[PDB]
Amino acid sequence: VLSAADKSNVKACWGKIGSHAGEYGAEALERTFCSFPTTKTYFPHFDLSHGSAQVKAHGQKVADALTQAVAHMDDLPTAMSALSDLHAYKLRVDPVNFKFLSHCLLVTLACHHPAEFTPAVHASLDKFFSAVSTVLTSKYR
Amino acid sequence: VLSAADKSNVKACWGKIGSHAGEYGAEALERTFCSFPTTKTYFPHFDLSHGSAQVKAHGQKVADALTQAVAHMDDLPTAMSALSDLHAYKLRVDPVNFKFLSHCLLVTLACHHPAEFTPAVHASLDKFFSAVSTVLTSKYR
Amino acid sequence: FLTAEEKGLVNGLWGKVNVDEVGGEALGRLLVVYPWTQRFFESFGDLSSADAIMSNAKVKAHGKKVLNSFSDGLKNIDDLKGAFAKLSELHCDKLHVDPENFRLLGNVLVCVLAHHFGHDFNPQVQAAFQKVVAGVANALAHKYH
Amino acid sequence: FLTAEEKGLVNGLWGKVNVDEVGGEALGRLLVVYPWTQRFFESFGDLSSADAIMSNAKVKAHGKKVLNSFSDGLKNIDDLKGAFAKLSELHCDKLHVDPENFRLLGNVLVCVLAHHFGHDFNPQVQAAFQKVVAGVANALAHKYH
Ligand code: HEM
Ligand code: HEM
Ligand code: HEM
Ligand code: HEM
């Protein structure tokens, strides 16, 4: 369960990210496809080259839903409902891949916001991404 | 989550099991400890010898918790509240190990009740064992 | 990859497996227990009930071909990577299967062995087949890129 | 195990690592990020806060030995298994650590590399260090029994 400090750490880190959201979403995905090649099996209809417009575009959408998730940290199961069904039942994404993406989200933020990425902010982000991806994997079976 | 037929198969299966539930919980442990040796790290102060009376006694308590869950498939989150804590807040067992036991349980049930272990009952049990584990690993991230 | 004892437990039981059906039973249980895997097999036909799936000729036929590759890796336990190299590339480049799913087929198959051999499928015997099925899974995963 | 292309990106970056403090930052964060791992290090003293954990001297110095272990494992990348044999036995027999925890220290170390190298820690450099930590981790898991 996220604590009050988790929430303010997550929100403050997200405010610093600012308008670079989709850009980081796009980088986070590419790192994921790159470091963990098996996640690429979920986007076979995608151009997956560096710079890929298609990856940029999806990057934005993933950014936008995490932003939507920063503002609903007390009822994430309500805010992520459509998305829960999509990943858990329509797409059948295995939970491990979520760890891969969450991890690459951490790397991208460590890379870009090193001053912000204190040990405590690291932990609050991990706790956050994990809670978001628990919602997105709940509707399976 | 679990369908009406899922609940029906678990109950009927569990009724074939009868007096052997504790034997089977003991054997499933024996099978987890053996096939997946890393799960022994959670029991460093146990006699893990083949046929250990300690493992048998633990076997009985896993079985009893599972019988409980059969009688509460309606709201495992509440029934299993107490036990959910123990597996996060003293133990913190990685969710994978629950996969190992669930599997070693199905293998135990197939070895003793092949005629009851239809693909459809196999399927219902897998959802059940996986439903239990989900609540026993809630309390994590 | 295995010890001498493991090799004997593994090969001992495998000589007793019906090759024409254990694989078809395992794949159809794959589809029953994990219905989302039926996305990968739409060209197989009536996948609509447990009974439809369990009597389906194409499931039996594919299942057979899968088990045969399990025996191939059994002949070549020393180099599972080599033996499953081409299959690994097929599930990658062509079938786009998440290697995470490979253990579900391994597991369902171990259940079929459990079901057939009862008391003979003992904990030490099972523990060797787990080394095999995860070796097979690793090998099938090795060529993803 | 590692191509000369990756081998260059890895040692290229490793050669710049502050060997005195990258390990203690990685171990400290493992304990901040994953609080249950702390029960393995009680001998280390005060771990009641991120500030206490992050300024702890036993934590810092155990971290250096862990980094030295990655360092030495880089010098033996073609046989990581052998270079981690006695550490695998140690973590199993003596420490009772679930190898599923090994993944968490590799990922934290990568995060520490990302935090410090920034724009230099690009997707390609990362992928390769992911390759390393996964193989170090599997080697540390190999001798469980
Ligand atoms: C941080 C957690 C994640 C979030 C917030 C997220 C969010 C999203 C969003 C916003 C969409 C777009 C839906 C739309 O365009 O209407 C989507 C779809 C999709 N997601 Fe995720 N996602 C996450 C993790 C993952 C993971 C780990 C995978 C698998 C590797 C994955 C695979 C997919 C696929 C294949 C689609 C459909 C894409 C398409 O056809 O355009 N997602 N998700
Ligand atoms: C099917 C899921 C599981 C169920 C229903 C279950 C059930 C139980 C029960 C009934 C107890 C009795 C203690 C009490 O009454 O407070 C217990 C404790 C315990 N469980 Fe589980 N268990 C499950 C999975 C696992 C797994 C996979 C592991 C790790 C490999 C594990 C590790 C432990 C440990 C270490 C204890 C305390 C033993 C001791 O220190 O004496 N459990 N569990
Ligand atoms: C480690 C376990 C697995 C083994 C040993 C295995 C083996 C095989 C083999 C031998 C073939 C070729 C059959 C032929 O030549 O006719 C094949 C093809 C195929 N596999 Fe698998 N496989 C495994 C896991 C999976 C999983 C988990 C899935 C998806 C959920 C999958 C989906 C498919 C599909 C769709 C084909 C093509 C079948 C067709 O011809 O229509 N496999 N596999
Ligand atoms: C990434 C994989 C890991 C590596 C490469 C690694 C490395 C090492 C090394 C080199 C030592 C020997 C240091 C010494 O005492 O001289 C050690 C000891 C130890 N390890 Fe790890 N470790 C890993 C993961 C873990 C994890 C995840 C935990 C706990 C959750 C852990 C718990 C311990 C403990 C408690 C000691 C003994 C510390 C002491 O008594 O001073 N290890 N490890």
PDB file of N, CA and C in Angstrom, chain C residues 9-90:
ATOM      1  N   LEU C   9      16.206 -42.291 -14.648  1.00  0.00           N
ATOM      2  CA  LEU C   9      14.819 -42.030 -14.239  1.00  0.00           C
ATOM      3  C   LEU C   9      14.028 -41.437 -15.402  1.00  0.00           C
ATOM      4  N   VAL C  10      14.657 -40.476 -16.090  1.00  0.00           N
ATOM      5  CA  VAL C  10      14.071 -39.766 -17.234  1.00  0.00           C
ATOM      6  C   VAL C  10      13.808 -40.710 -18.413  1.00  0.00           C
ATOM      7  N   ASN C  11      14.866 -41.400 -18.859  1.00  0.00           N
ATOM      8  CA  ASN C  11      14.794 -42.359 -19.962  1.00  0.00           C
ATOM      9  C   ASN C  11      13.989 -43.618 -19.641  1.00  0.00           C
ATOM     10  N   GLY C  12      14.124 -44.112 -18.409  1.00  0.00           N
ATOM     11  CA  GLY C  12      13.306 -45.223 -17.913  1.00  0.00           C
ATOM     12  C   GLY C  12      11.810 -45.058 -18.138  1.00  0.00           C
ATOM     13  N   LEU C  13      11.264 -43.940 -17.652  1.00  0.00           N
ATOM     14  CA  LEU C  13       9.847 -43.587 -17.826  1.00  0.00           C
ATOM     15  C   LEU C  13       9.460 -43.280 -19.280  1.00  0.00           C
ATOM     16  N   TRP C  14      10.353 -42.618 -20.007  1.00  0.00           N
ATOM     17  CA  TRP C  14      10.082 -42.232 -21.401  1.00  0.00           C
ATOM     18  C   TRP C  14       9.908 -43.423 -22.354  1.00  0.00           C
ATOM     19  N   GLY C  15      10.565 -44.539 -22.042  1.00  0.00           N
ATOM     20  CA  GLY C  15      10.372 -45.783 -22.792  1.00  0.00           C
ATOM     21  C   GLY C  15       8.980 -46.381 -22.615  1.00  0.00           C
ATOM     22  N   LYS C  16       8.204 -45.845 -21.669  1.00  0.00           N
ATOM     23  CA  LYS C  16       6.889 -46.398 -21.318  1.00  0.00           C
ATOM     24  C   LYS C  16       5.737 -45.500 -21.774  1.00  0.00           C
ATOM     25  N   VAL C  17       6.088 -44.291 -22.214  1.00  0.00           N
ATOM     26  CA  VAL C  17       5.152 -43.298 -22.731  1.00  0.00           C
ATOM     27  C   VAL C  17       4.573 -43.758 -24.074  1.00  0.00           C
ATOM     28  N   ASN C  18       3.258 -43.613 -24.247  1.00  0.00           N
ATOM     29  CA  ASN C  18       2.668 -43.756 -25.576  1.00  0.00           C
ATOM     30  C   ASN C  18       2.947 -42.481 -26.353  1.00  0.00           C
ATOM     31  N   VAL C  19       3.686 -42.641 -27.445  1.00  0.00           N
ATOM     32  CA  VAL C  19       4.158 -41.532 -28.240  1.00  0.00           C
ATOM     33  C   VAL C  19       3.031 -40.953 -29.094  1.00  0.00           C
ATOM     34  N   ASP C  20       2.056 -41.795 -29.439  1.00  0.00           N
ATOM     35  CA  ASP C  20       0.933 -41.381 -30.299  1.00  0.00           C
ATOM     36  C   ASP C  20      -0.065 -40.487 -29.577  1.00  0.00           C
ATOM     37  N   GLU C  21      -0.112 -40.572 -28.246  1.00  0.00           N
ATOM     38  CA  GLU C  21      -1.080 -39.730 -27.542  1.00  0.00           C
ATOM     39  C   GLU C  21      -0.682 -38.834 -26.355  1.00  0.00           C
ATOM     40  N   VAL C  22       0.396 -39.142 -25.628  1.00  0.00           N
ATOM     41  CA  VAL C  22       0.782 -38.304 -24.474  1.00  0.00           C
ATOM     42  C   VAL C  22       0.933 -36.816 -24.858  1.00  0.00           C
ATOM     43  N   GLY C  23       1.557 -36.572 -26.015  1.00  0.00           N
ATOM     44  CA  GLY C  23       1.682 -35.231 -26.603  1.00  0.00           C
ATOM     45  C   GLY C  23       0.381 -34.541 -26.981  1.00  0.00           C
ATOM     46  N   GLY C  24      -0.579 -35.306 -27.491  1.00  0.00           N
ATOM     47  CA  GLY C  24      -1.878 -34.751 -27.831  1.00  0.00           C
ATOM     48  C   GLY C  24      -2.714 -34.436 -26.603  1.00  0.00           C
ATOM     49  N   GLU C  25      -2.544 -35.250 -25.569  1.00  0.00           N
ATOM     50  CA  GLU C  25      -3.193 -35.058 -24.281  1.00  0.00           C
ATOM     51  C   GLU C  25      -2.638 -33.823 -23.586  1.00  0.00           C
ATOM     52  N   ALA C  26      -1.336 -33.615 -23.740  1.00  0.00           N
ATOM     53  CA  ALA C  26      -0.646 -32.510 -23.088  1.00  0.00           C
ATOM     54  C   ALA C  26      -1.008 -31.186 -23.757  1.00  0.00           C
ATOM     55  N   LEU C  27      -1.097 -31.186 -25.083  1.00  0.00           N
ATOM     56  CA  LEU C  27      -1.411 -29.949 -25.811  1.00  0.00           C
ATOM     57  C   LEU C  27      -2.861 -29.554 -25.658  1.00  0.00           C
ATOM     58  N   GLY C  28      -3.734 -30.531 -25.511  1.00  0.00           N
ATOM     59  CA  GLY C  28      -5.150 -30.254 -25.371  1.00  0.00           C
ATOM     60  C   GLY C  28      -5.506 -29.799 -23.980  1.00  0.00           C
ATOM     61  N   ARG C  29      -4.712 -30.255 -23.006  1.00  0.00           N
ATOM     62  CA  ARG C  29      -4.800 -29.750 -21.647  1.00  0.00           C
ATOM     63  C   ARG C  29      -4.209 -28.363 -21.596  1.00  0.00           C
ATOM     64  N   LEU C  30      -3.123 -28.127 -22.340  1.00  0.00           N
ATOM     65  CA  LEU C  30      -2.633 -26.746 -22.505  1.00  0.00           C
ATOM     66  C   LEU C  30      -3.772 -25.788 -22.899  1.00  0.00           C
ATOM     67  N   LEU C  31      -4.593 -26.210 -23.861  1.00  0.00           N
ATOM     68  CA  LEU C  31      -5.644 -25.369 -24.436  1.00  0.00           C
ATOM     69  C   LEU C  31      -6.851 -25.241 -23.531  1.00  0.00           C
ATOM     70  N   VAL C  32      -7.083 -26.286 -22.731  1.00  0.00           N
ATOM     71  CA  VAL C  32      -8.199 -26.337 -21.766  1.00  0.00           C
ATOM     72  C   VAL C  32      -7.865 -25.532 -20.519  1.00  0.00           C
ATOM     73  N   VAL C  33      -6.693 -25.774 -19.955  1.00  0.00           N
ATOM     74  CA  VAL C  33      -6.276 -25.105 -18.728  1.00  0.00           C
ATOM     75  C   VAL C  33      -5.950 -23.639 -18.991  1.00  0.00           C
ATOM     76  N   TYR C  34      -5.421 -23.349 -20.178  1.00  0.00           N
ATOM     77  CA  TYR C  34      -5.009 -21.986 -20.518  1.00  0.00           C
ATOM     78  C   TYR C  34      -5.634 -21.479 -21.810  1.00  0.00           C
ATOM     79  N   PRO C  35      -6.953 -21.177 -21.805  1.00  0.00           N
ATOM     80  CA  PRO C  35      -7.725 -20.999 -23.043  1.00  0.00           C
ATOM     81  C   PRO C  35      -7.191 -19.884 -23.935  1.00  0.00           C
ATOM     82  N   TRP C  36      -6.387 -19.002 -23.368  1.00  0.00           N
ATOM     83  CA  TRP C  36      -5.905 -17.868 -24.118  1.00  0.00           C
ATOM     84  C   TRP C  36      -4.864 -18.333 -25.140  1.00  0.00           C
ATOM     85  N   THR C  37      -4.270 -19.501 -24.881  1.00  0.00           N
ATOM     86  CA  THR C  37      -3.301 -20.107 -25.802  1.00  0.00           C
ATOM     87  C   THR C  37      -3.971 -20.600 -27.095  1.00  0.00           C
ATOM     88  N   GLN C  38      -5.303 -20.662 -27.098  1.00  0.00           N
ATOM     89  CA  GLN C  38      -6.058 -21.039 -28.292  1.00  0.00           C
ATOM     90  C   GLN C  38      -6.014 -19.977 -29.390  1.00  0.00           C
ATOM     91  N   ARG C  39      -5.628 -18.755 -29.033  1.00  0.00           N
ATOM     92  CA  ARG C  39      -5.339 -17.685 -30.001  1.00  0.00           C
ATOM     93  C   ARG C  39      -4.305 -18.100 -31.035  1.00  0.00           C
ATOM     94  N   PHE C  40      -3.393 -18.964 -30.605  1.00  0.00           N
ATOM     95  CA  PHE C  40      -2.249 -19.383 -31.399  1.00  0.00           C
ATOM     96  C   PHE C  40      -2.604 -20.526 -32.337  1.00  0.00           C
ATOM     97  N   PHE C  41      -3.792 -21.094 -32.142  1.00  0.00           N
ATOM     98  CA  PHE C  41      -4.203 -22.319 -32.844  1.00  0.00           C
ATOM     99  C   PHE C  41      -5.594 -22.250 -33.489  1.00  0.00           C
ATOM    100  N   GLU C  42      -5.908 -21.146 -34.165  1.00  0.00           N
ATOM    101  CA  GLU C  42      -7.247 -20.948 -34.742  1.00  0.00           C
ATOM    102  C   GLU C  42      -7.498 -21.837 -35.959  1.00  0.00           C
ATOM    103  N   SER C  43      -6.419 -22.163 -36.667  1.00  0.00           N
ATOM    104  CA  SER C  43      -6.478 -23.021 -37.829  1.00  0.00           C
ATOM    105  C   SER C  43      -6.699 -24.485 -37.486  1.00  0.00           C
ATOM    106  N   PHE C  44      -6.794 -24.818 -36.191  1.00  0.00           N
ATOM    107  CA  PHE C  44      -6.947 -26.218 -35.751  1.00  0.00           C
ATOM    108  C   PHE C  44      -8.401 -26.655 -35.783  1.00  0.00           C
ATOM    109  N   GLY C  45      -9.317 -25.703 -35.579  1.00  0.00           N
ATOM    110  CA  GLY C  45     -10.757 -25.939 -35.739  1.00  0.00           C
ATOM    111  C   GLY C  45     -11.654 -25.714 -34.526  1.00  0.00           C
ATOM    112  N   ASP C  46     -12.552 -26.676 -34.287  1.00  0.00           N
ATOM    113  CA  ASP C  46     -13.492 -26.671 -33.153  1.00  0.00           C
ATOM    114  C   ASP C  46     -12.708 -26.808 -31.845  1.00  0.00           C
ATOM    115  N   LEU C  47     -12.389 -25.657 -31.260  1.00  0.00           N
ATOM    116  CA  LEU C  47     -11.640 -25.569 -30.010  1.00  0.00           C
ATOM    117  C   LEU C  47     -12.578 -25.118 -28.888  1.00  0.00           C
ATOM    118  N   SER C  48     -13.837 -25.515 -29.016  1.00  0.00           N
ATOM    119  CA  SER C  48     -14.924 -24.846 -28.318  1.00  0.00           C
ATOM    120  C   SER C  48     -15.235 -25.405 -26.928  1.00  0.00           C
ATOM    121  N   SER C  49     -15.043 -26.707 -26.736  1.00  0.00           N
ATOM    122  CA  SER C  49     -15.239 -27.296 -25.413  1.00  0.00           C
ATOM    123  C   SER C  49     -14.049 -28.169 -25.042  1.00  0.00           C
ATOM    124  N   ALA C  50     -13.965 -28.562 -23.779  1.00  0.00           N
ATOM    125  CA  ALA C  50     -12.955 -29.522 -23.384  1.00  0.00           C
ATOM    126  C   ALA C  50     -13.058 -30.777 -24.251  1.00  0.00           C
ATOM    127  N   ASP C  51     -14.274 -31.211 -24.579  1.00  0.00           N
ATOM    128  CA  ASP C  51     -14.467 -32.445 -25.371  1.00  0.00           C
ATOM    129  C   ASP C  51     -14.149 -32.247 -26.835  1.00  0.00           C
ATOM    130  N   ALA C  52     -14.443 -31.056 -27.338  1.00  0.00           N
ATOM    131  CA  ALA C  52     -14.079 -30.694 -28.698  1.00  0.00           C
ATOM    132  C   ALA C  52     -12.556 -30.698 -28.804  1.00  0.00           C
ATOM    133  N   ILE C  53     -11.893 -29.960 -27.915  1.00  0.00           N
ATOM    134  CA  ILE C  53     -10.425 -29.934 -27.855  1.00  0.00           C
ATOM    135  C   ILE C  53      -9.770 -31.316 -27.647  1.00  0.00           C
ATOM    136  N   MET C  54     -10.332 -32.120 -26.744  1.00  0.00           N
ATOM    137  CA  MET C  54      -9.725 -33.414 -26.438  1.00  0.00           C
ATOM    138  C   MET C  54      -9.882 -34.493 -27.528  1.00  0.00           C
ATOM    139  N   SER C  55     -10.818 -34.292 -28.453  1.00  0.00           N
ATOM    140  CA  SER C  55     -11.012 -35.271 -29.528  1.00  0.00           C
ATOM    141  C   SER C  55     -10.547 -34.764 -30.899  1.00  0.00           C
ATOM    142  N   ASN C  56      -9.974 -33.554 -30.915  1.00  0.00           N
ATOM    143  CA  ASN C  56      -9.573 -32.876 -32.138  1.00  0.00           C
ATOM    144  C   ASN C  56      -8.339 -33.493 -32.796  1.00  0.00           C
ATOM    145  N   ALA C  57      -8.516 -33.977 -34.022  1.00  0.00           N
ATOM    146  CA  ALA C  57      -7.446 -34.631 -34.800  1.00  0.00           C
ATOM    147  C   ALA C  57      -6.163 -33.813 -34.990  1.00  0.00           C
ATOM    148  N   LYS C  58      -6.302 -32.514 -35.273  1.00  0.00           N
ATOM    149  CA  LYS C  58      -5.148 -31.604 -35.442  1.00  0.00           C
ATOM    150  C   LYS C  58      -4.371 -31.302 -34.147  1.00  0.00           C
ATOM    151  N   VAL C  59      -5.075 -31.236 -33.025  1.00  0.00           N
ATOM    152  CA  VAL C  59      -4.436 -31.156 -31.706  1.00  0.00           C
ATOM    153  C   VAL C  59      -3.623 -32.430 -31.397  1.00  0.00           C
ATOM    154  N   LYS C  60      -4.190 -33.595 -31.699  1.00  0.00           N
ATOM    155  CA  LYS C  60      -3.484 -34.863 -31.488  1.00  0.00           C
ATOM    156  C   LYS C  60      -2.229 -34.921 -32.358  1.00  0.00           C
ATOM    157  N   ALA C  61      -2.386 -34.537 -33.621  1.00  0.00           N
ATOM    158  CA  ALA C  61      -1.314 -34.544 -34.606  1.00  0.00           C
ATOM    159  C   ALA C  61      -0.213 -33.552 -34.258  1.00  0.00           C
ATOM    160  N   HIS C  62      -0.552 -32.285 -33.995  1.00  0.00           N
ATOM    161  CA  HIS C  62       0.454 -31.321 -33.465  1.00  0.00           C
ATOM    162  C   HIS C  62       1.113 -31.809 -32.176  1.00  0.00           C
ATOM    163  N   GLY C  63       0.296 -32.202 -31.194  1.00  0.00           N
ATOM    164  CA  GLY C  63       0.789 -32.736 -29.927  1.00  0.00           C
ATOM    165  C   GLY C  63       1.875 -33.785 -30.074  1.00  0.00           C
ATOM    166  N   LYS C  64       1.642 -34.746 -30.969  1.00  0.00           N
ATOM    167  CA  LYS C  64       2.623 -35.780 -31.374  1.00  0.00           C
ATOM    168  C   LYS C  64       3.961 -35.202 -31.830  1.00  0.00           C
ATOM    169  N   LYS C  65       3.889 -34.251 -32.754  1.00  0.00           N
ATOM    170  CA  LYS C  65       5.070 -33.537 -33.237  1.00  0.00           C
ATOM    171  C   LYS C  65       5.856 -32.808 -32.123  1.00  0.00           C
ATOM    172  N   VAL C  66       5.142 -32.267 -31.129  1.00  0.00           N
ATOM    173  CA  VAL C  66       5.774 -31.591 -29.974  1.00  0.00           C
ATOM    174  C   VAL C  66       6.550 -32.592 -29.107  1.00  0.00           C
ATOM    175  N   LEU C  67       5.933 -33.745 -28.849  1.00  0.00           N
ATOM    176  CA  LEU C  67       6.498 -34.769 -27.981  1.00  0.00           C
ATOM    177  C   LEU C  67       7.735 -35.365 -28.592  1.00  0.00           C
ATOM    178  N   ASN C  68       7.654 -35.624 -29.899  1.00  0.00           N
ATOM    179  CA  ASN C  68       8.799 -36.045 -30.713  1.00  0.00           C
ATOM    180  C   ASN C  68      10.024 -35.151 -30.523  1.00  0.00           C
ATOM    181  N   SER C  69       9.824 -33.827 -30.479  1.00  0.00           N
ATOM    182  CA  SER C  69      10.909 -32.875 -30.156  1.00  0.00           C
ATOM    183  C   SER C  69      11.406 -32.967 -28.711  1.00  0.00           C
ATOM    184  N   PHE C  70      10.514 -33.293 -27.781  1.00  0.00           N
ATOM    185  CA  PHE C  70      10.924 -33.654 -26.425  1.00  0.00           C
ATOM    186  C   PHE C  70      11.861 -34.895 -26.420  1.00  0.00           C
ATOM    187  N   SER C  71      11.562 -35.901 -27.248  1.00  0.00           N
ATOM    188  CA  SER C  71      12.420 -37.081 -27.376  1.00  0.00           C
ATOM    189  C   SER C  71      13.739 -36.736 -28.062  1.00  0.00           C
ATOM    190  N   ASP C  72      13.687 -35.826 -29.036  1.00  0.00           N
ATOM    191  CA  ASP C  72      14.888 -35.353 -29.711  1.00  0.00           C
ATOM    192  C   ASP C  72      15.877 -34.730 -28.725  1.00  0.00           C
ATOM    193  N   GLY C  73      15.371 -33.839 -27.867  1.00  0.00           N
ATOM    194  CA  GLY C  73      16.166 -33.219 -26.798  1.00  0.00           C
ATOM    195  C   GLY C  73      16.633 -34.205 -25.725  1.00  0.00           C
ATOM    196  N   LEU C  74      15.846 -35.262 -25.536  1.00  0.00           N
ATOM    197  CA  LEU C  74      16.238 -36.397 -24.709  1.00  0.00           C
ATOM    198  C   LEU C  74      17.427 -37.177 -25.291  1.00  0.00           C
ATOM    199  N   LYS C  75      17.424 -37.419 -26.604  1.00  0.00           N
ATOM    200  CA  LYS C  75      18.578 -38.044 -27.278  1.00  0.00           C
ATOM    201  C   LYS C  75      19.806 -37.149 -27.110  1.00  0.00           C
ATOM    202  N   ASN C  76      19.584 -35.837 -27.229  1.00  0.00           N
ATOM    203  CA  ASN C  76      20.626 -34.797 -27.241  1.00  0.00           C
ATOM    204  C   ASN C  76      20.619 -33.858 -26.029  1.00  0.00           C
ATOM    205  N   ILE C  77      20.471 -34.439 -24.827  1.00  0.00           N
ATOM    206  CA  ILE C  77      20.433 -33.733 -23.533  1.00  0.00           C
ATOM    207  C   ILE C  77      21.665 -32.894 -23.249  1.00  0.00           C
ATOM    208  N   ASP C  78      22.779 -33.303 -23.851  1.00  0.00           N
ATOM    209  CA  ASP C  78      24.074 -32.617 -23.761  1.00  0.00           C
ATOM    210  C   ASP C  78      24.080 -31.241 -24.418  1.00  0.00           C
ATOM    211  N   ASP C  79      23.331 -31.122 -25.508  1.00  0.00           N
ATOM    212  CA  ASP C  79      23.170 -29.854 -26.212  1.00  0.00           C
ATOM    213  C   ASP C  79      21.698 -29.633 -26.581  1.00  0.00           C
ATOM    214  N   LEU C  80      20.915 -29.201 -25.594  1.00  0.00           N
ATOM    215  CA  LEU C  80      19.530 -28.806 -25.825  1.00  0.00           C
ATOM    216  C   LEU C  80      19.452 -27.539 -26.678  1.00  0.00           C
ATOM    217  N   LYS C  81      20.404 -26.624 -26.493  1.00  0.00           N
ATOM    218  CA  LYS C  81      20.477 -25.411 -27.314  1.00  0.00           C
ATOM    219  C   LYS C  81      20.520 -25.723 -28.814  1.00  0.00           C
ATOM    220  N   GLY C  82      21.481 -26.554 -29.232  1.00  0.00           N
ATOM    221  CA  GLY C  82      21.593 -27.002 -30.609  1.00  0.00           C
ATOM    222  C   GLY C  82      20.320 -27.646 -31.125  1.00  0.00           C
ATOM    223  N   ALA C  83      19.816 -28.616 -30.355  1.00  0.00           N
ATOM    224  CA  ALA C  83      18.603 -29.389 -30.701  1.00  0.00           C
ATOM    225  C   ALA C  83      17.306 -28.575 -30.812  1.00  0.00           C
ATOM    226  N   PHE C  84      17.211 -27.472 -30.061  1.00  0.00           N
ATOM    227  CA  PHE C  84      16.021 -26.607 -30.102  1.00  0.00           C
ATOM    228  C   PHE C  84      16.262 -25.223 -30.722  1.00  0.00           C
ATOM    229  N   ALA C  85      17.396 -25.079 -31.417  1.00  0.00           N
ATOM    230  CA  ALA C  85      17.826 -23.832 -32.054  1.00  0.00           C
ATOM    231  C   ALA C  85      16.876 -23.358 -33.136  1.00  0.00           C
ATOM    232  N   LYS C  86      16.547 -24.253 -34.067  1.00  0.00           N
ATOM    233  CA  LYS C  86      15.600 -23.952 -35.141  1.00  0.00           C
ATOM    234  C   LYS C  86      14.167 -23.799 -34.654  1.00  0.00           C
ATOM    235  N   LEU C  87      13.778 -24.588 -33.665  1.00  0.00           N
ATOM    236  CA  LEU C  87      12.448 -24.439 -33.104  1.00  0.00           C
ATOM    237  C   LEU C  87      12.302 -23.107 -32.400  1.00  0.00           C
ATOM    238  N   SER C  88      13.351 -22.721 -31.672  1.00  0.00           N
ATOM    239  CA  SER C  88      13.447 -21.443 -30.964  1.00  0.00           C
ATOM    240  C   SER C  88      13.239 -20.227 -31.859  1.00  0.00           C
ATOM    241  N   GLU C  89      13.867 -20.247 -33.033  1.00  0.00           N
ATOM    242  CA  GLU C  89      13.730 -19.210 -34.051  1.00  0.00           C
ATOM    243  C   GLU C  89      12.333 -19.171 -34.672  1.00  0.00           C
ATOM    244  N   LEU C  90      11.722 -20.339 -34.838  1.00  0.00           N
ATOM    245  CA  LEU C  90      10.354 -20.455 -35.340  1.00  0.00           C
ATOM    246  C   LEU C  90       9.311 -19.815 -34.415  1.00  0.00           C
TER     247      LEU C  90
END
